[PDB]
Design a protein around this ligand. Structure first.
Ligand SMILES: [Ca+2]
Lengths: 30, 223
């Protein structure tokens, strides 16, 4: 799954394991 | 919080916002000097904001205290998120009042079906992003261990509980991590993780705080 921390991202590596960088620049589940 | 409602101002006085420039996680005030949160919310510097309702507007009633100590559970594991619990020591004690209050640790583990209150400033959409200024609230029941395990096969440790709705639509979400799940005046869960938010058969997964009462009391009485 994706931990529920708010992270502003530019690309997936900005994100914790199990998350990707979403279409609005927030980390979340694929 | 997806599918919840806007909390009445300061109706969840143990709720804090963890801020590193902006809000990024929740936490719960457990004594005047210490906040409990999720370990995956670790950052080397954290500002704790207490008495908040609108995190974007200064109401004049909030307390802003930087963390002096941030202690992740020693066994925390960033890959299965077992032991996803963290203690933050405030650099100065919070002033307790009607809007800034402690929440009790659990006297005992919470039974399936127990109704709880989950809260936070996380995403309110299960698709797309909509981050609220005002604290959101959701009533939700504790799910049985088997249904939790069934929802996330091979992923729920004995240190995790599911709270929510298998039909979807109501859940915590990104930005809610570290926040409280309170049932009968007791902090039973910490927002931890999930597959997306508010998806069918994918309830929120929360740290089972009743397993940590010894670690918590003791970590405090050492730092
Ligand atoms: Ca405010």
């Amino acid at each position: 799954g994706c931990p529920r921390i708010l992270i502003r991202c530019k690309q997936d590596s900005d994100c914790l394991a199990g998350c990707v960088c979403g279409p609005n620049g927030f980390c979340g589940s694929p | 919080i997806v599918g919840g409602y806007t909390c009445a101002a300061n109706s969840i006085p143990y709720q804090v916002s963890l801020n590193s420039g902006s809000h990024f996680c929740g936490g719960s005030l457990i004594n005047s000097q210490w906040v409990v949160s999720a370990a995956h919310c670790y950052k080397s510097r954290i500002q704790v904001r207490l008495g908040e309702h609108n995190i974007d507007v200064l109401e004049g009633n909030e307390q802003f205290i930087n963390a002096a100590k941030i202690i992740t559970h020693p066994n925390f594991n960033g890959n299965t998120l077992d032991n996803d619990i963290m203690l933050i020591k405030l650099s100065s004690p919070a002033t307790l009042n009607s809007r800034v209050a402690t929440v009790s640790l659990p006297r005992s583990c919470a039974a399936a079906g127990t109704e709880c209150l989950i809260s936070g400033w996380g995403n309110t959409k299960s698709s797309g992003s909509s981050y609220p200024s005002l604290l959101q609230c959701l009533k939700a029941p504790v799910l049985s261990d088997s249904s939790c395990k069934s929802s996330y096969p091979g992923q729920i440790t004995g240190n995790m509980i599911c709270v929510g709705f298998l039909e979807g639509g109501k859940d915590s979400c990104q930005g809610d991590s570290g926040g409280p799940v309170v049932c009968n005046g007791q902090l039973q869960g910490i927002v931890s993780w999930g597959y997306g938010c508010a998806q069918k058969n994918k309830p929120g997964v929360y740290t089972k705080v009743c397993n940590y009462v010894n670690w918590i009391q003791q970590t405090i009485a050492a730092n």
